[PDB]
């Protein structure tokens, strides 16, 4: 099916670390054999599934591979190049910045080697518009998260359009909602996006209102918004009043077990009422999956034809954190592009 990878693409949730291909992970493992690290440690196989819990283990062991800023850099080099072969045109990277003494790694130098990243992949002239999203962890507590933020704040200003916003990721058990409202709601007041992981689990209404009342740009995942443990009408209502886009996952969601299948996947609930929502990969390497593999899934689990398909791509460009001229831009790449993605 090359109409999918062919198919002018998005991205808006993607996690740095857990976007590592398995060609990279081969790559960091051949530079650290010392850490007794196997490949099938950081990826859940087709036909295989793991509990939300056993995918953050992953990231702790994924982690212990990138930990200078010359693994950064070469992540963040192969991870923009395996995006733009698979058609993807405009892409919002999400990592949280780490320090590590070992190496000298500052949360700072972090940020500086995903922007050289970035940099190195323009003068390569790749067909892909990338962005940086700062990621808050939860686990990080709520110092840390001043200190992201006041970090991503800099980095908003000086950056011109490179870094756009702030990610809100990380154990959702973790934590509660209003440690983290001061440092999200000074970015909000500094004029950074914030895309926000909600509802990701069941039984959390009240944590779930909270962080809606930051009123996010974007809401990653929302999967128990509708379900009467953890969500309501309430709480669809608030997001469907707001137009608050929703950054869907389909393998993600199965492979972590937090949806039982593609075809209950929440994806059919939200489009049967055409809210804003663009198909993402969330960790493309740990899920072992591509964008346009999930525009597949989502277009055969919910027989959308390959117009319907475009309309979706399409309509994405909209939720993009980036200017008016951007959207632009790239709504001119999309239909420049059209004849030869849809035929007759
Ligand atoms: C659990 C993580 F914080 C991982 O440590 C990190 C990996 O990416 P990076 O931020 O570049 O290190 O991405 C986050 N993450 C990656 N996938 C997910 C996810 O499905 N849900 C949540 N809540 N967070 C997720
Ligand atoms: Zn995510």
């Given at each position: 099916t090359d109409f999918y990878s062919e198919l002018p693409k998005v991205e808006l949730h993607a996690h740095l670390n857990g976007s590592i291909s398995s060609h990279t992970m081969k790559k960091l493992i051949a530079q650290k054999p010392?850490?007794?690290?196997?490949?099938q440690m950081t990826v859940i196989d087709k036909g295989k599934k793991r509990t939300l819990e056993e995918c953050f283990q992953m990231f702790q062991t994924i982690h212990q591979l990138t930990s200078s800023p010359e693994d950064i850099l070469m992540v963040t080099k192969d991870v923009i190049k395996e995006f733009a072969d698979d058609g993807v045109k405009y892409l919002e990277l999400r990592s949280t910045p780490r320090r590590e003494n070992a190496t000298g790694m500052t949360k700072k130098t972090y940020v500086e080697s995903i922007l050289e990243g970035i940099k190195q992949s323009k003068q390569e002239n790749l067909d892909i518009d990338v962005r940086y999203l700062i990621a808050v962890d939860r686990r990080g507590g709520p110092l840390v998260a001043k200190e992201t933020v006041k970090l991503a704040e800099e980095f908003f200003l000086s950056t011109e359009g490179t870094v756009l916003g702030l990610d809100l990721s990380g154990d959702?058990?973790?934590?509660?909602?209003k440690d983290f409202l001061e440092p999200l709601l000074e970015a909000k007041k500094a004029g950074l996006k914030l895309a926000l992981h909600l509802?990701?689990?069941?039984?959390q209404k009240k944590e779930t209102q909270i962080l809606l009342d930051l009123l996010p740009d974007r809401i990653g995942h929302?999967?128990?918004?509708?379900?009467?443990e953890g969500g309501s009408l309430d709480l669809v209502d608030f997001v469907r009043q707001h137009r608050i886009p929703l950054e869907l996952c389909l393998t993600s969601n199965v492979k972590s077990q937090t949806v039982p299948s593609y075809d209950q996947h929440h994806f059919g609930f939200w489009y049967s009422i055409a809210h804003p929502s663009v198909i993402c990969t969330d960790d493309k390497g740990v899920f072992a999956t591509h964008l346009s593999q999930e525009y597949q899934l989502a277009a055969e689990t919910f027989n959308l034809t390959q117009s319907q398909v475009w309309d979706l791509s399409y309509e994405?460009?909209?939720?993009?954190?980036?200017?008016d001229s951007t959207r632009s831009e790239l709504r001119k790449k999309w239909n420049h592009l059209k004849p030869r993605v849809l035929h007759i």
């Open positions: 010392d850490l007794k690290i196997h490949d959702p058990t973790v934590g509660q909602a509802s990701e689990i069941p039984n929302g999967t128990f918004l509708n379900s009467g994405s460009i909209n939720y993009i954190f980036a200017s």
